[PDB]
Amino acid sequence: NMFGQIQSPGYPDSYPSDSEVTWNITVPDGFRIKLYFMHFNLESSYLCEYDYVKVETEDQVLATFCGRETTDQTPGQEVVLSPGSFMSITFRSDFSNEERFTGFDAHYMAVDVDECKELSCDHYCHNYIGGYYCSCRFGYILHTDNRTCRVECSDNLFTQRTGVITSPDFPNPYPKSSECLYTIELEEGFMVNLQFEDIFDIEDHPEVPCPYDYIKIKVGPKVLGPFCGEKAPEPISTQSHSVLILFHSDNSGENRGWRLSYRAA
């Protein structure tokens, strides 16, 4: 079902009267139908109510043709493309073909849908015949949704008296679908003070507290947050030599993220 030919009854002779033939064309998923004509010779009438070639889908009429390609409503060299993978064609003939119209000769074929051109791929889209797939930029990992591109952002440990911690690629949009664990572990006796600076931009919601992306900060047996939005939390003075910062990002958005510096009190 990648291709086919269709003719009116009797072709290349004049078609009979009182005839009605329907052809249903189905192609696999990821394909559309292309239809064109090499010969078209029908009765010409007002809005093709008498004799006609009707091209339609299951819920939509794509085209209706009648008349003669010579001096007339005809398809001409025009291609009829279906929106999806289905096309129905009906040739109808009324009660009298006294002029001996010779009908039509048509050809159809499956055409690949280019999904990349038509929940899209986060980074790269790759089209192929019958489908498509997504891939990611260097340094990113395709998520389990087969669509978004996450990163590994947990392989860290901050042990020095002062330091800087940011969302991945800050201040460029942070990676979607990621789960970053930043760990501060200073020397016993040191107490960590946290301080946000620069751009702060974490996707939020006007009514619901941080339903999408957020920072949580665990110090001792207690979690601070979640934090999101355009306004950073106020500086945080812990009484702890160790702090965990968890940054969660969902499958959507282009927010720029956050930066913090830490210092021992």
Ligand X SMILES: *[C@@H]1O[C@H](CO)[C@@H](O)[C@H](O)[C@H]1NC(C)=O
| Pick from 130, 92, 91: nearest CA to 113 | 130
Minimum distance of ligand X from residue 146's CB (angstroms): 4
Q: Is 203 in the site for Ca ion (CB under 5 A)?
A: yes
198 binds, among Ca ion, ligand X, its own copies, none (CB under 5 to 8 A by kind): none
Task: Give the binding site for ligand X (CB under 6 A).
Answer: 145-146
Q: Using the minimum distance from each CB to ligand X, give the nearer residue, 49 or 128.
A: 128
- Locate tokens 């020095």: which residue? 160
Q: What is the dihedral of CA 12, 14, 15, 16, to 10 degrees?
A: -140
201 binds, among its own copies, Ca ion, ligand X, none (CB under 5 to 8 A by kind): none
Phi-psi region of 257 (alpha: psi -120 to 50; beta: other; left: phi over 0): left
Q: What whole-number distance in Å separates Cα of residue 82 and Cα of residue 3?
A: 14
Q: Which is nearer to its own copies, 95 or 138 (CB)?
A: 138
Confirm or reject binding of residue 44 to Ca ion (CB under 5 A): no
As given in the structure block, the two tokens for residue 220 are 């001792």
Residue 43 contact partner, candidates its own copies, Ca ion, ligand X, none, CB within 5 to 8 A by sort of partner: Ca ion
Q: Which does 97 bind (CB under 5 to 8 A by kind): Ca ion, its own copies, ligand X, none?
A: Ca ion
Token pair 């990349």 in the structure block, residue: 116
- Residue 253 CB-density burial (10 A; 0-12 exposed, 13-18 middle, 19+ buried): middle
Could you say which of 56, 72, 105, 112 contacts Ca ion (CB under 5 A)?
112
Cis-peptide into 12, omega within 30 deg: yes
User: What number of chain residues touch Ca ion (CB under 5 A)?
Assistant: 16
- Our CB check for its own copies shows the closer of 41 and 238 to be 41
Q: Does residue 14 belong to the site contacting Ca ion (CB under 5 A)?
A: no
- For 11, the token pair is 């072709």
Using CB under 5 A as the binding rule, whether residue 185 contacts Ca ion is answered as: no
43 annotated ligand binder: yes
At residue 140's C-alpha, the angle toward residues 136 and 143, to 5°, is 75
Nearer to its own copies, 89 or 245 (CB): 89
Residues in the chain: 265
Annotated binding site: 43, 51, 94, 96, 112-113, 115, 127-128, 131, 203, 213, 250, 252
